[PDB]
Design a protein that fits this description.
The protein is mainly alpha-helical and about 160 residues long. The protein has helices at about 5-10, 40-50, 60-80, 80-90, 95-110, 115-120, 125-135, 135-140, 145-155; strands spanning about 15-20, 25-30, 30-35. It is found in: Host cytoplasm.
Length: about 160
């Protein structure tokens, strides 16, 4: 299992504009298009992103190209953020996958707000960090995905997805 398969499980694949759990306009594999209410603003962002007139619809190929870009951007973001990179460097390969997942979902800024949890991960206090991470809007809003990530940080194995 690798980062791509993991995220594919968490976000799903949709070839037509859709609304996310938050109600925002998304396409493909969790690619946020705009927090704007206008489907029109969304279609415009979408054509800008693909370089063609899509009329709200993209092929698999296109969806995958977006996905490659976004995972790349997530990793580079971690590597550019001081707080984030310190954590990342301290972690094993599976746990690193879990941090990437959070970054892809909630952006750099968002994750960097998890001060206390990040400190605990750095200290390798797995159980404790797992319990703190669950005390978030994130967990209350998308509990099943959040639990899958949390277990990944807790155990350091792919168990939560070995199911899926």
């Amino acid at each position: 299992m690798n980062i791509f398969e993991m995220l594919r499980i968490d976000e799903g694949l949709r070839l037509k504009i859709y609304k996310d759990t938050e109600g925002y306009y998304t396409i493909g594999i969790g690619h946020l298009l705009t927090k704007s209410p206008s489907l029109n603003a969304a279609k415009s962002e979408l054509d800008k992103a693909i370089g063609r007139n899509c009329n709200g619809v993209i092929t698999k190929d296109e969806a995958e190209k977006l996905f490659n870009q976004d995972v790349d951007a997530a990793v580079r973001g971690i590597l550019r953020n001081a707080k984030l990179k310190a954590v990342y460097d301290s972690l094993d390969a599976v746990r690193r996958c879990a941090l990437i997942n959070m970054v892809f979902q909630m952006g750099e800024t968002g994750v960097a707000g998890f001060t206390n949890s990040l400190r605990m991960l750095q200290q390798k206090r797995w159980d404790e960090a797992a319990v703190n991470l669950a005390k978030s809007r994130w967990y209350n809003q998308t509990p099943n995905r959040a639990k899958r990530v949390i277990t990944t940080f807790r155990t350091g194995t792919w168990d939560a997805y070995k199911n899926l």
